A = this chain, B = another copy of it.
Amino acid sequence: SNDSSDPLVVAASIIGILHLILWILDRLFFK
Minimum CB–CB distance for A2 against chain B, Å: 14
Q: What DSSP secondary structure best describes chain A's contact surface? A: helix
For the complex formed by this chain, how many copies does it contain in all?
4
How big is chain A's contact interface, by range? 10 to 19
Cα A2 to Cα B5 in complex, Å, equals: 14
Identify which of B11, B13, B26 contacts A15 (C-beta below 8 A).
B13
Cα A8 to Cα B20 in complex, Å, equals: 16
Knowing that A12-B12, A22-B27 touch, tell me 13 more A-B residue pairs with CB under 8 angstroms. Answer: A8-B9, A8-B10, A8-B13, A11-B13, A13-B15, A15-B16, A15-B17, A15-B20, A16-B16, A19-B23, A23-B23, A26-B27, A26-B31
